[PDB]
């Protein structure tokens, strides 16, 4: 029900072996799921539909400048959270089907 | 030293009266409130901080986009647009966080000057 | 060797049934390939590796404001041209593997 | 009535001295040269046209990004960043084309004011 795809805007490639942390809003953040992006820049199998209940979720992407993406959304369909990384910028898109 | 500029990609206009919250990471890893405001008619927010108070650290900028879109009659995806970055670790710099907003997508760009 | 994916940033969905025209630089533009995006917002089978030779290509995406994406690049790997559409903005990303 | 602003997402800075070419579609569907210039130290380009000459029509803005990146020591994907749009079909408006550049990605946003 939830997938994450990370792309590298400098190289035009998947961002590989990037640590991704997913949190669910308790109201502090409690760890929900995590992994490292694959060769395709993807992270699948983070959760099941049974455990991916309604609530607020945060996707953190931990890769001369340090910045960090934090994607916060209400969920519950299938969700793809895409992020495109640059040294001084990122973009994120949600595809909900 | 710290400003925020927000554009609306649905209207092709500045995003006006968008709430922005800035936090700074404290030594014990909590987020302390640092500054807040709302964007002007030009989609800009100035006066968040002074050079004295904007010390080296890790800062989190949250742009309250859900409230913005809903007031426009759009049901958006994200709660906020958010970015975390390290500031002033090579001495004082001036930072503009430039955000481009769509209901299901956003970008945040740091424009850093010396 | 060449695929195109179109997304809708207002709806968080594939952009479906959007006409896409591909041109190759002759130096005017001559039609190289075209189609309409599928249910997944994708356009596959535009060309074969044999015919996708080195050169300059242009991908045109024809969907109170009218604007139009034109993505121009030198090719020749596999190329994914992604575009994300908004009423007054678009983004495009190239993933080359 | 027509300005261009360009940011560099690799350097987190304005994109300076980037060539920009604007074209207008003629009645017989050819593209006629309309205006050109280079961005300033602030990444901005003004003075492309006057209100008189910026009539209703379809305009194409090309930002010469390949030359820009290569001078920086980056091998980019695109030849240019390009956008085609209809201008002034509801009477005169002022347009800013705001571009955000990375080697393998860009966005172009029209900020339209009355």
Any idea what DSSP says for residue D91? Answer: B
D57 has a chain A CB within 8 A of its CB: no
Cβ of residue B107 closer than 8 Å to a chain C Cβ: yes
Contact criterion met (CB < 8 Å) for D82 and C91: no
Provide CB contacts within 8 A for B96, sequence distance 6+: B3, B4, B5, B110, B111, B112, B113
How many residues would you count in chain D?
114
* Residue D91 CB burial class (10 angstroms; 0-12, 13-18, ≥19): exposed
Cβ–Cβ under 8 Å, residues D35 and D49? yes
Q: Are residues D32 and D24 in contact, defined by beta-carbon separation less than 8 angstroms?
A: yes
Reported as type and span, the H/E element at residue D13 is strand D13-14
Q: Which residue of D has its CA nearest to B109?
A: D9
- Residue B37 belongs to domain spanning: 1-114
B100 interfacial to chain C (CB closer than 8 Å): yes
Q: Copy the structure tokens of residue B34.
A: 């640092």
CA gap D49, A69 in Å, rounded: 39
Which of A34, A37, A90 lies closest to A67, judged by CA? A90
Return the CATH number at B38. 2.60.40.180
Query: Is the Cα torsion angle C29, D47, D107, D14 positive or negative in sign?
Result: positive
Contact A61, A83 (CB under 8 A): yes
Rounded CA-CA distance C82/D49 in Å is: 32
Q: Which of C12, C65, C87 sits opposite B77 (nearest CB)?
A: C12
A35 neighbors A18 (Cβ within 8 angstroms) = no
Residue-wise burial string across D73-82, b where 16 or more C-beta atoms lie within 10 A, e elsewhere: ebebbbbbbb
Q: How far is residue D88's CA from residue D2's CA, in Å, rounded to a whole number? A: 11
The whole-angstrom separation of Cα D20 and Cα D82 is: 10
With CA atoms as reference, report the closest residue to C4 among C73, C64, C51.
C73
Q: Which two tokens stand for residue D1?
A: 């009535």
Please judge whether D78 and C94 are an interchain contact, meaning their C-beta atoms are less than 8 angstroms apart.
Answer: yes
Q: How far apart are CA A34 and CA A46, in angstroms?
A: 7
Name the method of structure determination: X-ray
CA C5 to chain centre: 7
Displacement of CA C82 from its chain's centroid (Å)? 7
User: Taking the CA atoms of chain A, what radius of gyration do you get in angstroms?
Assistant: 13
Q: Are C27 and C71 in contact (CB under 8 A)?
A: no
A91 is known to lie in a ligand binding site: yes
Report angle CA B82, B87, B93 to the nearest 5 degrees.
120
Distance in Å from the first CA to the final CA of chain C = 10
Query: Tokens 């990146």, residue?
Result: D69
Q: Which residue has the tokens 């983070």?
A: A46
The neighbouring-strand residues paired with A75 are A55
**Interchain CB distance below 8 Å, C93 and A9:** yes
DSSP assigned state of B30? P
Chain A residue with Cα closest to C86: A93
- Tally of domains within chain C: 1
Q: How far, in Å, CA of C88 to CA of A2, rounded? A: 29
Distance CA B15, CA C88 (A): 13
Distances (CA, A) of A6 to A18, A69, D45: 8, 11, 33
On whether the CB atoms of residues D48 and D11 are closer than 8 A, the answer is no
For the purposes of burial, counting CB atoms within 10 Å of the CB of A47, is it exposed (0-12), middle (13-18) or buried (19 or more)? middle
Q: Is C91 part of any known ligand binding site?
A: yes
Query: C85 with C63: CB under 8 angstroms?
Result: yes
Q: What CA–CA distance (Å, rounded) separates A33 from A21?
A: 6
- The DSSP bridge partners found for residue C76 are none
């Amino acid at each position: 029900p939830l997938m994450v795809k990370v792309l590298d805007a400098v190289r035009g490639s998947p961002a590989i072996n990037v640590a991704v942390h997913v949190f669910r809003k308790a109201d502090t953040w409690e760890p929900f799921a995590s992994g490292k992006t694959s060769e395709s820049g993807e992270l699948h199998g983070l959760t099941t539909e049974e455990e991916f209940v309604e609530g607020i979720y945060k996707v953190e992407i931990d890769t001369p400048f340090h910045e960090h993406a934090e994607v916060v959304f209400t969920a519950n369909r299938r969700y793809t959270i895409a992020a495109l990384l640059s040294p001084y910028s990122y973009s994120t898109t949600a595809v909900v089907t």
